[PDB]
Structure formats: C-alpha cells, structure tokens
Amino acid sequence: SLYNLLVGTYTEGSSEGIQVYRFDGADGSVKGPLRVAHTSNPSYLTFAPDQRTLFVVNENGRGGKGDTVGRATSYRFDPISGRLQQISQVQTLADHPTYSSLSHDGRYLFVANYSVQPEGSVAVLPVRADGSLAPVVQVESHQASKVHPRQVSGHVHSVVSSPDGQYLFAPDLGADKVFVYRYAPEQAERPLQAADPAFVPTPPGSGPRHLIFSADGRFAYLTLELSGQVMVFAHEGNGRLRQLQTHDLAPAGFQGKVGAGALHLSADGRFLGVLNRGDDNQLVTFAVDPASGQLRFVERRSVEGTEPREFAFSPGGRFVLVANQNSDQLRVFARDPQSGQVGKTLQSVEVGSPSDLRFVAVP
C-alpha cells in the first residue's frame, strides 16, 4: 500500500526544497527521498482534486538570507516517478506566506501572508486553466490586538473555505479574530467580499491560527496558538460561527510553555488531532461527538522532538506522522483507528526543518 509522501520544509538548513518520499501503508515505513524540487522555503502544500496540480507557498521574508519576498509556486506532480515540474511562480505581496487553499471552483488560490514584520494579509491569486498562477488581484490586511508582542501587526495564518465554498475564513494570529469573506467570483476584480459579521473574535492574546471544518460543514475547529487551546464552533452557513467549547491542550498543572499548532480530523470524522508545541510537544487526540460536534479528550502522545509543525494521519489511519521542525525529523507512530490511540514509535526520519506532509497514492 504505497503512497507518495511530499514533505514541505524550510530551507535555511540542509533542505533544498520539497522532498518526495514513499510511505508503505503495510508497515508504516518511510523511504527516500526519491526526488527533491529545489525551491525556497516551500513550507505548505496544497493539491487540486486531481492530485497532480500542486500549489506551494515560499515562506520568505525580509530578514532572510536568500530570497526575501513571499512567493507562491505551482507544480505538476507525477505520482509514478515522483517528479515535480514547476509551472509558475508569482509574488504574494507580503512576507512569509504560510498557508494556501484553492477556491472551490479552482479559480483562485487564497494565500495567508503571515509576515513577521508588518504587515500580513490575505492575498488572492488567480489560477489559469493550465494551473499557472497570475499576479495578485486582492490583498486584505488587518488591525492587530497588541495583546502579545507577536500581535503588534496582523498575521494571517490560514485561509479556509467552508465546505460549500461560499465563504473564506482567515484566522489572524495578530488580530485575535477570524476574518470572514464571501467568495464572489462574479467580481473578478475583488473576489473576496467582507461578510457579516466581518469577523469572529477570539480571546485577547489567544492567537487564532488554523481552522478546519467537519466534512458536513456543521462544525469548525480552531487552534489558539498563544493560549494553547482549541475552540469548537457551530457553523451556520452564511459565514457565521457560534462558539460552543474551548479546551486546553495541556493538562491542568502543566508548567512550561504551550503553543497550539496544526489540527486535522481523521478520515472517519471521529477524531481530532491537535499539536501543542512549547515545552509540551504533544499530539493531543480528542473524540468528536457527531451530534454536538464537541470534543472529549482521549490522550496525549509525545512527538519526541521540538516544534512539531504539522502532522498527517496515514490514509488507512493505522499510523500518524509528525513533522518536528526544530528537531529536523519526521516521526512515524503506530495508531489504532478504533480507539484513536497513538502508540509505538516506528521510525524517525532525518529531514531538514520539515513543515508539512501530504499523501498521494501511487497509481
């Protein structure tokens, strides 16, 4: 049961770009890399539904040694050989683009410019029929909350459409808000229209980061980086969210820094995994109530490294893989798809500053 495993990375160290590995669902082994696509800081990977057209953010910023402006790059991917072919590359108009997503009709790539220095933004990039990117047509920056030093300017950390695709949600870690836009392709010159409400506030100094929706669009889950929490919302459609629940990621009595990072639901909708960084460095697993969407704590598993940046459940659910950015390693763990429990460490993979993981089956 063999899959391509594409690994995004930061390229300040040994990595030279996107690394292509092979994952075996039969034993959990990771082998490679087979190929590396040379490019600057390809830290987040987004595939079109064909699983052949790949969109990448080049998370460059002004204080870098190398390229200093944010870019987005598109690729074609051959899942037989592992080959990646660059199609196009354009500026995102702000530093550190760190996340992207395609509009539901494929007409645009929404980009989250994080921008360590002022100012971050949502950027809108048209996508041509051949998968090439066109220059930015819209840029939206935001007012910051100034509750934490990391919030003196706006920092967009994800851009996520509702599953029906009509609205685009943009958690801004510097604003303590999730901004909400209506997607209006009929207005090619400004496809993102501010909705009502225009945002969903989060607690002061909480740092909203990543948002996901349940498959049925009824609920949304949001990490709060600075507070070390995950928030549960009911999604009403029309771009409206109402708060249901907030849960700490670290136990009561945990002394040490915390940081909430990536989150993903399992393919059966039954479990939510959330990373907590800081001094905690755990994958936190919750059971998801299908009726209320609320979360019940199941377990915490040490990621055996520092700054876990992303993770991915394996396609069959019998493994989970964590990218430990500061440790320069991937870790593969056994997983029980029934209980959601994460077990024995099966392998550690040395890779420079890994930041994202994506599975594509080998035809």
What is the residue-wise DSSP string for 193-244? EEEEEEEEE--TT--EEEEEE-TTSSEEEEEETTTTEEEEEEEEETTEEEEE
Region of 203 please: left (phi>0), alpha (psi -120 to 50) or beta.
beta
Strands 71-77 and 53-58: antiparallel
Residue 126's identity, in one-letter code, is: P
**Distance in angstroms (rounded) separating the CA atoms of residues 318 and 295:** 21
Asked whether 273 and 285 are in contact (CB, 8 A), the reply is yes
Asked whether 265 and 239 are in contact (CB, 8 A), the reply is no
> Which backbone phi and psi does 225 adopt, to 5 degrees?
-65, -55
**Distance in angstroms (rounded) separating the CA atoms of residues 357 and 311:** 7
Instruction: List the 97-102 sheet strands across, edge first.
Output: 97-102, 108-113, 121-126, 138-140
Strands 17-24 and 2-9: antiparallel
Strands 271-276 and 295-302: unpaired
Q: For residue 262, what are the domain limits?
A: 1-363
Interacting residues of 121 by C-beta distance below 8 A, sequence separation 6+: 93, 94, 113, 115, 139, 140, 141, 142, 154, 156
Q: Looking at residue 219, which CATH number applies to its domain? A: 2.130.10.10
Question: Facing residues of 348 across strands?
Answer: 331
If you search the block for the tokens 């400004």, which residue do you land on?
A: 190
- Specify the number of domains making up the chain: 1
Asked whether 29 and 2 are in contact (CB, 8 A), the reply is no
The neighbour count for residue 190, using CB atoms within 10 Å, is: 13
